[PDB]
Amino acid sequence: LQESVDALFDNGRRGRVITGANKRPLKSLADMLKGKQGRFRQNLLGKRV
Amino acid sequence: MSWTDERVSTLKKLWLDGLSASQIAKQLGGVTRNAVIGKVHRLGLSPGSATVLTLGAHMCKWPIGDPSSEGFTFCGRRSSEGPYCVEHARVAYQPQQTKKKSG
Amino acid sequence: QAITRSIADQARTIRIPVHMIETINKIVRTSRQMLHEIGREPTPEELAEKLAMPLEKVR
DNA sequence: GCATCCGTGAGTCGAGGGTAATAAGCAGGGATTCGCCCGGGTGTCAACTCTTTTTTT
Ligand SMILES: [Zn+2]
Numbered sequence: 001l002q003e004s005v006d007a008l009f010d011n012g013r014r015g016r017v018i019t020g021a022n023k024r025p026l027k028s029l030a031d032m033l034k035g036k037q038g039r040f041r042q043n044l045l046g047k048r049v
Numbered sequence: 050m051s052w053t054d055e056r057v058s059t060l061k062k063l064w065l066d067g068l069s070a071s072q073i074a075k076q077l078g079g080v081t082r083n084a085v086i087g088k089v090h091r092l093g094l095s096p097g098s099a100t101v102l103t104l105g106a107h108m109c110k111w112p113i114g115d116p117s118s119e120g121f122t123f124c125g126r127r128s129s130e131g132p133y134c135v136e137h138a139r140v141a142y143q144p145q146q147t148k149k150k151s152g
Numbered sequence: 153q154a155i156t157r158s159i160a161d162q163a164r165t166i167r168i169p170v171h172m173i174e175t176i177n178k179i180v181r182t183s184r185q186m187l188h189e190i191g192r193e194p195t196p197e198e199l200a201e202k203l204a205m206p207l208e209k210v211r
Numbered sequence: 212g213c214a215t216c217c218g219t220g221a222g223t224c225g226a227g228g229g230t231a232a233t234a235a236g237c238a239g240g241g242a243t244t245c246g247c248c249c250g251g252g253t254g255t256c257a258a259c260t261c262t263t264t265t266t267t268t
Contacts, residue, residue, distance in 0.1 A: 020232095
């Protein structure tokens with residue numbers, strides 16, 4: 001349970017949690033705001049017009 | 050069967066006081082099993098040297114005999130750091146432990 | 153029983169009853185057997201008569 | 212006071228479009244859900260009486 005909790009937030013510090021169907025690693029809340037969907041260039045600074 | 054004002058009252062009473070739902074329709078008469086369930090759902094409100102008592106810590110616990118028999122006791126000897134005794138530790142556990150795998 | 157009863161509840165990602173999943177497994181097994189020992193591919197029309205179920209249910 | 216080991220980075224706009232695998236069984240009891248039907252509140256109409264602005268006398 002503790003592993004699931006602290007992997008739901010980052011998913012990178014501990015062992016990687018990969019779904020059985022998809023071969024790509026899951027994107028937790030921390031990874032969602034770093035480079036892909038964070039405020040770097042996706043939503044906050046750079047957006048469609 | 051009927052669904053008068055008294056039919057719902059007796060049904061609610063018999064469902065509240067406690068009774069098998071299958072026999073509820075038979076006791077009321079006429080109403081089937083499916084009708085009473087729909088009504089309650091629609092309307093809502095649904096030998097050794099120690100016995101089994103004088104067994105202290107650090108003592109043997111290997112049973113001897115039958116528990117449902119007259120005389121059933123344990124060894125009760127110096128058997129610290131283990132549930133069973135040294136004389137039975139080699140007969141209870143797997144003798145000659147040889148197991149290994151990958152890790 | 154504990155491993156099979158729990159694998160069909162949490163791993164599916166959606167609420168699927170046990171009778172539904174067992175019927176799905178039986179239908180898949182019979183379809184594979186018919187496709188392997190009858191012809192090219194079993195049609196859903198004959199799957200109802202083979203399993204003795206209505207067409208609306210098998211569909 | 213140094214030697215060894217674990218995090219961050221990598222430009223930017225455009226094209227291209229959908230995906231994919233394993234598979235027990237049956238008996239008990241309840242909760243759920245789909246068909247029919249009586250029904251009472253909402254519409255859509257024949258059909259009986261005051262007012263009055265003239266248009267006729
Ligand atoms: Zn003993």
